[PDB]
């Protein structure tokens, strides 16, 4: 929610989200094989090129 798409992919390249959830749910019931199974894309903003060429260096 709080940061942009360049940084959410930087989180999905490890599995920082899955490791964070796994450590958080240790008190309720210890989970082990925790991942973000799938990411889907529903909506994109109207295409920009300057925003693409920042992502391409």
């Amino acid at each position: 929610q709080t940061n942009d798409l360049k940084e959410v992919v930087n989180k999905l390249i490890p599995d920082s989200i899955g490791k964070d959830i796994e450590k958080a749910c240790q008190s309720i019931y210890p989970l082990h094989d925790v991942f973000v199974r799938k990411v889907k894309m529903l909506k994109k903003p109207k295409f920009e090129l300057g925003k693409l060429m920042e992502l391409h260096g």
């Binding site: 940084e7 930087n10 989180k11 390249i13 490890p14 920082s16 490791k19």
Partner: protein
Amino acid sequence: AYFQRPENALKRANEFLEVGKKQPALDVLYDVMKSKKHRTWQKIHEPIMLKYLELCVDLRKSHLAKEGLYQYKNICQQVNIKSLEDVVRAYLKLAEEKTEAAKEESQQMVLDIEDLDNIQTPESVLLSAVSGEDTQDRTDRLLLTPWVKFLWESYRQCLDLLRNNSRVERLYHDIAQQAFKFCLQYTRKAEFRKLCDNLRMHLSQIQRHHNQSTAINLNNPESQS
């Protein structure tokens, strides 16, 4: 398992750091040092341990740098001990610079913030002045002492566990000398413990004479020098 090809630990460690999670980045490197991959020192084991001890400093976890080096000394036994020398010198080097920065930080920015702040004695500063002393020690304890109490605990652990006797280390005596000069920069009551440390480790040598260890006799290096 965790890994095949132990160099991948560096890539996961580096990937986690770009997000800014040095606790699980350290967990990755910790899992590789203690596993099947105990092959007597791979060329990639140095950059792993260099990053490992950088993160151990940045988080301040002496008891992890203990276990890390304790594993390393084992996987770089008589194969090559230059690796131990380079690693542990670079560890204590990194910790010394964190304390250098920590003082200069607290002693130019925050020390000037301290006597920038209105000294004109309110009730809260006057009440504590039947037990307590100056504001600089009162807030230098908040931003410097956790770094010098780490430098001490870093030195003592590097001496005690790792280099008990073990003839092949002149580094042991280098550390001892460096940590005596460390006491001229900071606290003194962590120097009586240092003396007692040398006393018991010397007592530990000439009581047993029972391992591939220091023969304190005509041997000029490991007796005189």
